[PDB]
Amino acid sequence: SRRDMEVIKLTARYYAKDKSIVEQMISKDGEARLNFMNSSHPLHKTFTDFVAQYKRVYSFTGQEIKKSKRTILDNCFERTQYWEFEKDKDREHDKLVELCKIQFAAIPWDKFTQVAKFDLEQMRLRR
Amino acid sequence: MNLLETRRSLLEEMEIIENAIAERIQRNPELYYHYIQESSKVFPDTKLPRSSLIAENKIYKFKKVKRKRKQIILQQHEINIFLRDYQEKQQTFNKINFERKLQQLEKELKNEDENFELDINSKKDKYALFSSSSDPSRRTNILSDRARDLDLNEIFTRDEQYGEYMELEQFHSLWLNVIKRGDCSLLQFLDILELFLDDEKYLLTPPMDRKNDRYMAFLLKLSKYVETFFFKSYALLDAAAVENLIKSDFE
Amino acid sequence: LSKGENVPYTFQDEQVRSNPYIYKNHSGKLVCKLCNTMHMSWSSVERHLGGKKHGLNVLRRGISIEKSSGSVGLAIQVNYSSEVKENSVDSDDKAKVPPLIRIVSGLELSDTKQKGKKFLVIAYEPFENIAIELPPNEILFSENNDMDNNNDGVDELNKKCTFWDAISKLYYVQ
Amino acid sequence: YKLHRYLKYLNDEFSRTRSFVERKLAFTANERMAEMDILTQKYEAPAYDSTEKEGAEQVDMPYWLYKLHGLDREYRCE
Incomplete structure (x- = not known):
């Protein structure tokens, strides 16, 4: 898995600074190698992790x-x-x-008294 | 080598260690409590938990099973080495802290395509490297793989019982050799030691003349022993902090 | 002692009963048709209905029933009291329990006349039950909406598609 | 000075030991022997026993029916 790991972490390294180099790479090359860029590919999630982590290293650089x-x-x-x-x-x-x-x-599910006949996740919050 | 990756791995390992010694402090709160209590009487400012928590051996709601002394001390020394590792990593980290190049490296990543091998060993080997019971097949030794060759019996003698007692018989012997007689019993010797609990007695009511050779030598050996015993029995407290505190009080 | 109810004879071919089990046989005695007990007087019966055997046979019948019976979706908005009567009962007795919904087949009714459709029953402790007929065999019956998280609550239906605005007392279901 | 302040920080251990001394001293032969046995065992014992608890946290059917009906009684068909 060393390959996958390395590409995830590299595209994550660059994606952590600009986010523009990858969006250009995708259109320039056209390789099924970076298929993890879409949130569809499972690994994508772990990606979101690595980047965040790198983003964090940028936090206290100089401290x-x-x-x-x-x-x-x-x-x-x-x-x-x-x-x-x-x-x-x-x-x-x-x-x-x-x-x-x-x-x-x-x-009692037999105490009936009917009248007539015939997105919530963002709703089950507060704002 | 991209420093970003290195610093990353560092922060990650630090996180791992904190998580380990936190899991420990979780299973048996005594580990911290014990430590903290002692700390209380060295650095007066230190805030200590509610007594109830200490007694019931609980951190929030759940009261945890009481552990025996040998294990508490063990884990405390293990946490000691852990904190050492952490301090080291923190140090190196402090000392360490485009598109054409992206494709440039992604190209070289194609190297050795035929590497048939499963790689699940970066966070697992670390997480594992620092967790409870990392030595035996399943559950035999509480010690982590990190400190698998850690043995308390090489630090504490049997008469000390991992900090329960301090063996002073030996010093009673040497003392008999110092006073050149036998009128002194183990208990009378301890009665002598008590002088050193007072701030003035050991100075104004000395067992022997404080300019006597044998006496000063003895006192040296004994002092050394007491100090090593102290820090030995309380790994979790910063030794350097205490040392410097005492030195500054002295000066 | 009967509180004025007409307890019907056993042969009379069923006015909902206060309970529904007690009867009178071809003779005059009173009988529990669950428990097959015979009673001398209303006073005896109230002892039985308040007894531990008549408790069990309800549970047994409880189980015995509980073992057998891009599109368009429906949404219901049920409103509840405005701190009008709920001011006398606040002893944390299931007060934390939100309303519950279940899909019931009309194959079983107090009258048992016509049937053949489902109902989306909604229930809350004090208030009375409510039903909504669902002729369509299937609507809004989704496919793995969330990412398989396991707090069953009551059932997949309730967690999957219900919301309980407890602060305003509004129960939404879709 | 160090002996002084370190002994102060260890007052509880000093007392604990002095106590131990007086105890052992007031023992008999058999008593002293058994006590020594105990200290020894504590010394050469695993820090974690194969018989310890993990997750024991504190906080802060138709019996006579099957006999009556005649069931759950051992029998055999040859």
Whole structure:
């Protein structure tokens, strides 16, 4: 997989600085090599990762990281804490779901009283 | 070599290590708690968690199983070497931090097309290189592949019990040799050591004359022992920080 | 004690019953037709309906029923009370549970007269159930809409295509 | 000076040991021997036992029916 990895990471390196060199390369060459550029190709996702990462390296270029031992420890503790929190959210969710299953299983689906006869993902948010 | 890739791999490895020692701090909060408590009495400013958390051995909601001392210490030394690696990488990183060339390299990437091989070993070999239980077939040794040859018994003697006690019998012997008699018992010797808990006693009520040779030599050996024991039993605290603190207090 | 209901005779060929199981045989006694128990008086019956055996036989019948029975899509907008009566009940008793939808076959009804079509029933604890007839064999029955994430909630139908604006009390279904 | 401040930082360990000393001292022969055995075992024991817990976190059917009906009773057809 070394080839795929290398091309992904390279086109990711260039794509991280300009985003114009790849959009020109695609039209210039015409090779089924960069087929990962479309969000259709699975690997595309990992691509979006690498680029981001490189984009990140561009963040603090010219800035050094001076984290000390104490600090690193504190940080890892806080990360742990976070993980625990997330775990708790997962638990709660599972619980609520359980309740729902119980009630759904426990209501009269024969108490009918009808009247007539015959995108939500971006909607299930807030703005 | 494109520095971008190197710096990337560096930040990634640092992330991996942080994640490892964080997973550890997660399974057994004591690892941090223990450490932090000691730190509290060296650097007074340090903020420490709610007592309840410490006792119930929990970080948020879940109370984790209590571990035995040998394991806590072990993992603390492992985390120690991890933090060493991290500090190194952070260092090198600090010291390290067009289209025609794109096609130029993409062309050379065609090199050796017939390389039939599966490559799933960059993040997996690292993630694995730093995780719990990385040594045995499945689950036999908590130590990670990173520190697979780490052994506490080569750092602690049996009488120290991984920091539970400090072996002072030996120094009681040397002491008998120093006072040129036998009127001194192990307990009376410890009674002597207590002087050094006071800020003035060891100075104004000395066991022997502080200008005596045998005495000063002994005191040297003993001091060295106590210090090495201290940092040995608390790997997680920055040794250099403590050293410098004490030195500045001295001056 | 009967609260004035006419409990029907067993032979009378079915006015929805308060419950629906209790009857009177060819003699005058009262009987549970689920549990096959015979009762002397209304007082006895209310003991049975409040009993642990009559509980079970409902669950058993519960299971026994639950084991057998680019295009255009429909969207329903169901509105609920405006803090008018829900001010007396707030004891976290399934209050966190959102409305639930299920597709029911008309093969089973309290009257059992005509049938042959489906209903998109929607239910919430206090309010009364609601149904919508679906003559078309299939509409909006999509194909892997999201990327296979597994929180079954109640079923693929509910997570797949429902929204519960709990802040405004509006249940959308499509 | 270092002996001073490091011993101060280790007051709990100093006390813990002094205690140990007095204990062992007030032991008998058999007692002292068994205690030593314990320290030894603690010393030469795996840091993780094959019998440890992972994920044990705390927070903060028709029985008489099959006998009555006569089922789940062992029998054989030859």
